[PDB]
Amino acid sequence: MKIDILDKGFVELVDVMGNDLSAVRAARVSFEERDRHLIEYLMKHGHETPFEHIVFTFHVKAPIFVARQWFRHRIASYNELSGRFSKLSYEFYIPSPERLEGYKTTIPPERVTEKISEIVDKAYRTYLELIESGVPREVARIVLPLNLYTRFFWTVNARSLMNFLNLRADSHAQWEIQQYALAIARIFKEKCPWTFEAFLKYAYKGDILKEVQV
Amino acid sequence: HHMKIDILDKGFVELVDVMGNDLSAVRAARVSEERDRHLIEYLMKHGHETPFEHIVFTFHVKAPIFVARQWFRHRIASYNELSGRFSKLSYEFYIPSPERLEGYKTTIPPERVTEKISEIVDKAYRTYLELIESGVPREVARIVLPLNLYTRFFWTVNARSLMNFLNLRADSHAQWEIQQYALAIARIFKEKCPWTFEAFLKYAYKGDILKEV
Amino acid sequence: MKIDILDKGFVELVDVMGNDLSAVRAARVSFDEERDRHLIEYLMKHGHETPFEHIVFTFHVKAPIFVARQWFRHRIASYNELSGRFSKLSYEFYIPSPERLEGYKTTIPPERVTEKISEIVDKAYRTYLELIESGVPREVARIVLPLNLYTRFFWTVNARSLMNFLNLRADSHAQWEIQQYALAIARIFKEKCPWTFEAFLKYAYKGDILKEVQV
Amino acid sequence: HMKIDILDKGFVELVDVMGNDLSAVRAARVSFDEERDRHLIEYLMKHGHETPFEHIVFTFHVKAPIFVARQWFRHRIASYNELSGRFSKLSYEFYIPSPERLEGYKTTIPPERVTEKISEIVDKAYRTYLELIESGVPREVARIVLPLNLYTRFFWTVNARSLMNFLNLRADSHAQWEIQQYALAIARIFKEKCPWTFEAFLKYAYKGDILKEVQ
Ligand SMILES: Cc1cc2nc3c(=O)[nH]c(=O)nc-3n(C[C@H](O)[C@H](O)[C@H](O)COP(=O)(O)OP(=O)(O)OC[C@H]3O[C@@H](n4cnc5c(N)ncnc54)[C@H](O)[C@@H]3O)c2cc1C
Ligand SMILES: Cc1cc2nc3c(=O)[nH]c(=O)nc-3n(C[C@H](O)[C@H](O)[C@H](O)COP(=O)(O)OP(=O)(O)OC[C@H]3O[C@@H](n4cnc5c(N)ncnc54)[C@H](O)[C@@H]3O)c2cc1C
Ligand SMILES: Cc1cc2nc3c(=O)[nH]c(=O)nc-3n(C[C@H](O)[C@H](O)[C@H](O)COP(=O)(O)OP(=O)(O)OC[C@H]3O[C@@H](n4cnc5c(N)ncnc54)[C@H](O)[C@@H]3O)c2cc1C
Ligand SMILES: Cc1cc2nc3c(=O)[nH]c(=O)nc-3n(C[C@H](O)[C@H](O)[C@H](O)COP(=O)(O)OP(=O)(O)OC[C@H]3O[C@@H](n4cnc5c(N)ncnc54)[C@H](O)[C@@H]3O)c2cc1C
């Protein structure tokens, strides 16, 4: 399972422990219609702890400004590329003109896209000039813009994942992280369809997952 | 099939599920064999612990409440236990065997201690039944039950928190009863993550009993 | 601040870091009354919970072990409890009063239930003393003590986790015994953070008893 | 007012503190003599009894470059409130490494030219950003062109146990020089408020190097 996001980003499923029945087993402390009914009962009454026994590992490629928002979710495990020592692809998120639709801009949205590519090209060339002259990466990389792509592994249980979808798969969140949250919701739906449907029905406080088919 | 280890007279540690193995920590450390095992020893030696959070276990444990209270102090984990208010219980209790009192100079034989423990457990359980039969709700009636009453719980924990649990509980300073439970956790962990377990015993394990037993 | 709970229990305030303005400062990332109170209500109303993590409390609680086990399930907090292996204990037990069984149709009078609970507690405690006198270590001998034995612990918790605790424990679905302790926690919280507590009751509180019982 | 300047425009400022060394002593004993209290702090540190130190809490206000704040926010056992890149007003200040930061590195151009080239690209990125804002582009999109050395501000609420884990990892020569400077300031404030815990930490638990080399 791999879903492309933005111009060069992605959300990829690395591993998963369990499925809907893992929450049923934990709720009953015991190793179809009755099991699905139990998932809905747990969700309808705020019994969230059984859902902590379903765990996912994702491999995400996202711009640093999106990764900073994501890393605010503390109840999860992260391993990211080192800005000091890792090899980077040096790819950057260049918003398409349609990203500025709805905004009354003084210049055409095409010019915004061009100006963004222009400054990232200059910052990247300056960075290369510093590396070529012997400056270590940990110092030279500080000139790189916030739209630089990074990669990380994210291990998260279904309860914390559902909190993430409540907050990020919502119109109040930045459009870029909304797109990533839609991909997380899609993989979550594929692996835990009963929990996902129950979540949308009773616990989900956001808006876009009840408007967009994932 | 899955690992199951019996502990004490009626307890057990059972493996329900596991996500990953040693290579899950290697994949997370690289964000992407002698070289893979060498990377595990390197992460362990230099204290790079976060990759080990990408290996997760789910156990089903049956333990006396006094042991479970010690276990539930490990907050970086997920728990689901039988409800003392609403769950049906087996009403089993941990009766220490006479050998548990070896080394202690007791005025009565250790066999009599075992008998006195079974005796008070029987009286508390019969009093409890008398209260339930007369309409007292379980959430009130169960408060007379002794601390050696067996409970059951699911424990979902990553390898990093599990290794912290072994440092603290698989050690002679911890109570003998929880040491037995920690040996079973260490055993299942070794079976699923042999490279991480060996690296842990070699460079990070602070206790004593895992290097003796 | 000390509030008695049950027959021998208590909730006592040991220390507190901050007040309502600590959440205001954190929300604005900056070190008047109506504007500050309006901000507390805005953050509460829209689910901006992280600012409330910058208000912290330390309580000293004396509660029966069955109550303490429910409390220790709240992992986003710090605990230090008396050791069952090595601490000196008071050997006090929670004996429910007859009024605790009101509403239940019992075969025997509620007074007899209270008596039977004191009776088995006394026998378990005497058996425990007989084991200690004969050389059995406390870590083994104490396993015969009932779940209503009182323990003591220090609880350090931030206002966000404390509000989650009130949502779950200051509610009629929770056991009556932990509800009484949650009312005392809500009371001390109200005294120290009156704006946050009022905003909490108005917009984020999911329970029922804090909107029924005067605190 | 404890405030320590870090780098060219950064700082670590103490906002509030709950407790001191005696807060860990009270939690260890579960109870609400100088030599005996200091001896207990050393005993807890020596034998790895860490939970009592969770009852001492600090709140800091930090101004650090985003590349440093990202390293700091990896410490999950803490509370954070940062300026919003989408909606907050910013000072638009950037960390320009001084020539001495490149000492020890054999560079093809003088270290002064590296500093100049960094200021140069920072100025161009900032001017491009202003051109986008002036033309109606929202800040959440326009700001993505700003470099990683842009200063941000955040409130950090952390207990002494997590703070000591942070010092173990960041107040060490293996960590990036920039975050070590911030960790030294955190250690100084910690030492001022909890001198017994800090000394005990340095004697028995600290695994880094620089806090045993720098006073
Ligand atoms: C639209 C939007 C705007 C935002 N704007 C800002 C902003 O301007 N500035 C900013 O700093 N942040 C901002 N955030 C980030 C936000 O404050 C949270 O950090 C983020 O959403 C993670 O939420 P969380 O704490 O619930 O998640 P996690 O950290 O994963 O926590 C999950 C749950 O665990 C519990 N929890 C975890 N740790 C603690 C703790 N230490 N204390 C108490 N309970 C805890 C809580 O119940 C929490 O819901 C914004 C988020 C969104 C969605
Ligand atoms: C021999 C022995 C005797 C003990 N005696 C007592 C006793 O008398 N009284 C008593 O109350 N307890 C006692 N304990 C329990 C002990 O204090 C811990 O509560 C328990 O071992 C869990 O340890 P932990 O905090 O490392 O684990 P977890 O709670 O799982 O935490 C794991 C790790 O996460 C971090 N952590 C998690 N939450 C926080 C937080 N809020 N702040 C900072 N860091 C955090 C720390 O790095 C910690 O090591 C005893 C334990 C042992 C082994
Ligand atoms: C009426 C009632 C009945 C209950 N019955 C039972 C029962 O029968 N059996 C039983 O075992 N328990 C039972 N519980 C306990 C319950 O499951 C919780 O353990 C307890 O209420 C603590 O809530 P919490 O997990 O939100 O609190 P905390 O553990 O303090 O967590 C606070 C917040 O942090 C987050 N969180 C913390 N750790 C994690 C994690 N590892 N993964 C994801 N998110 C995390 C969540 O957002 C959570 O809301 C009962 C509770 C109530 C109120
Ligand atoms: C020199 C150096 C280089 C680094 N390089 C990289 C890098 O290349 N890439 C990268 O991604 N990170 C890197 N890191 C960051 C590192 O992996 C940690 O994220 C960071 O040090 C935070 O430490 P912590 O996890 O112990 O802290 P916290 O998250 O504050 O945790 C405190 C303690 O709580 C416990 N804990 C908290 N949450 C959990 C959990 N979910 N499961 C288990 N235990 C838990 C642990 O005992 C931990 O020590 C680097 C750090 C250093 C110092």
Author numbering:
A (entry chain C): 1 to 31, 38 to 220
B (entry chain D): -1 to 30, 38 to 218
C (entry chain A): 1 to 31, 37 to 220
D (entry chain B): 0 to 31, 37 to 219
Text lifted from the article:
Many microbes, including human pathogens, utilize the flavin-dependent thymidylate synthase encoded by the thyX gene to generate dTMP. The mechanism of action relies on the reduced coenzyme FADH−, which acts both as a mediator, facilitating methylene transfer from CH2THF to dUMP, and as a reducing agent. As expected, the enzyme formed a tetramer where four identical active sites forming large cavities were generated at the interface of three different monomers. Here, we report the crystal structures of T. maritima ThyXred alone and in the presence of dUMP as well as the crystal structures of the ThyX Y91F mutant with FAD in the oxidized and reduced form.
As mentioned, the interaction between Y91 and H53 could be a key factor in the closed conformation of the folate site. To investigate this further, we generated the Y91F ThyX mutant and characterized it. The Y91F mutant has a flavin content similar to that of the WT, but with different absorption spectra of the reduced forms, indicating an altered flavin environment in the mutant. In addition, mutation of this Y91 has been shown to induce a 1000-fold decrease in flavin oxidation rate during the methylation reaction compared with the WT.
